[PDB]
Amino acid sequence: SLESYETLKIKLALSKYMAMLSTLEMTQPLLEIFRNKADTRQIAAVVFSTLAFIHNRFHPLVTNFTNKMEFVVTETNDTSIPGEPILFTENEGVLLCSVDRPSIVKMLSREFDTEALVNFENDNCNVRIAKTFGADFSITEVEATQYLTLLLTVEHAYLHYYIFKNYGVFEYCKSLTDHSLFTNKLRSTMSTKTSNLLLSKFKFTIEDFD
């Protein structure tokens, strides 16, 4: 399908993101790393590097980035707010961000489904048994799902940060009270590389019923 190569390009950008940080400093699966305080600074650096890649692919026209900013890990509702497990802040010049690890840890736990859903295969001997006649790499779909999930999670944060930077604190608050600016906007200067951004990919809605 014409859809097919777009899916392949999306998978390609996905893996292009994945491998670099899956090799650099990569000690253990994400869940193992995040389960404990073990190098909270490692978790911080991981998130920072993810944000760096996001800035890269959003604005690759100029690859430079201000490496300097502060990290905060917190562990309590008093320390967190629903819906935004990441929060940017600025204090008298001190640019900082804060996150609640347990929220995301709990989040990355229910990915247990399987996709017995729709058409595939074109089940045929030619498809399979024809080539049944004739003629450490360890990865799995559930882990790919988890990692893509976390990426999409960080997308929200990165957009928030970008807008806050470009428009100042007032609009930061305004947007947090109302993300309507996010509402249905591919429209941009090309420098956003808006097609690079995964909002363009898939769509969802609730129905309020009874």
């Binding site: 014409l2 392949l8 045929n124 498809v127 080539k131």
Partner: protein, 307 residues
Amino acid sequence: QSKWICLRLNDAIIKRHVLVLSEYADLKYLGFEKYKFFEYVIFQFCNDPQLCKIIENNYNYCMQIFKAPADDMRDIRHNIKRAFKTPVLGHMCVLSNKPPMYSFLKEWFLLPHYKVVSLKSESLTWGFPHVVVFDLDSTLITEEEQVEIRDPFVYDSLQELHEMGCVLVLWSYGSRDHVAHSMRDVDLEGYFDIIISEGSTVQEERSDIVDYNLKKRFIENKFVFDIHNHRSDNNIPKSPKIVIKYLSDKNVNFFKSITLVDDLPTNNYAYDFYVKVKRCPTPVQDWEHYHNEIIQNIMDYEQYFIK
């Protein structure tokens, strides 16, 4: 008039078929695993030598290089069959990503690629056949209102043609209705394979039920032929498009060659062979030289090249 190049797949997991390329990078539309579905792929020769060099470095498939200034369907097929030592070849695939504008190839069957896996295989012959096309108009009938065969020898020769494993296709340009009476006068339903009618005219093919009396098992020979040329002339060519269409409808999927026998050279668009019928209001009984012509035309590839 161009140089040309072709892929030959290493493993013909699907055989016989060929494709035509506008870009070497068009591969990206094909993506993973889809490449295994095509035996050959022609491309116009590289202008940039680096493209041909990358080709030469590639080991995933074999390839060939040649000149074909003869920008003709059948001549290109001849050249490729020479290059790959093969008597019979499959259909030519096309994609929504529109083909290169080699539109001199316009008049042909075009295969929407995805069908290729869906394609059946057919009982109709145990071996790959040749095919021969015929008309009614001034064709093999005597020209009077009631017609003899030009020879009963020809009458039975039509039957014996089945001994060679070859296909008989009659498309009367003449009117539909009378042909049923014609066959009732002299029936070749036991002697002939395929029947079509009402080809006489080209008509404005642009965007802007039968057998009620006697239970014939015939069809609407539907007007589905393009204007195809958008020009001021007067020609009604026999359409390989329509012919291959009805063939594959009869699940006829591969063939060695096709010949035309007709009174109009004009309708021949580079058919492999043309037999200009001699007009004949009397039984000429000349058939034996027609026989010889047809037999030698068939025999052409026994040397493995038609010449």
